[PDB]
Amino acid sequence: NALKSDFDSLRDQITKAASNAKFNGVSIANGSTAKLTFLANSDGSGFTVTAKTL
């Protein structure tokens, strides 16, 4: 039971650290969006980063 309580607390720490990772309110690690497309050229063609959920 003690090992179970430790493992569950570590799982909760994962979900908290994963949810907390943001910058300007957008985030890639949390899985709240499919991709993020930053600009790449004057024309507006954009570098695309595929999001990776954590």
Add this chain to the structure above:
Amino acid sequence: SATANSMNAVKDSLQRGQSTIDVALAAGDTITDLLGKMKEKALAASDTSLNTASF
């Protein structure tokens, strides 16, 4: 001699046209700088990573 005198009115009209186009050219330079800045604004806004406030 009468013709050579009327050439003065001709020259006055030409100088008036020059001054008119000069004012238009100054306005055009200001418009071009504004247009370049708006192109930069629309470019920065087209980004999708922006939070709503900056948009």
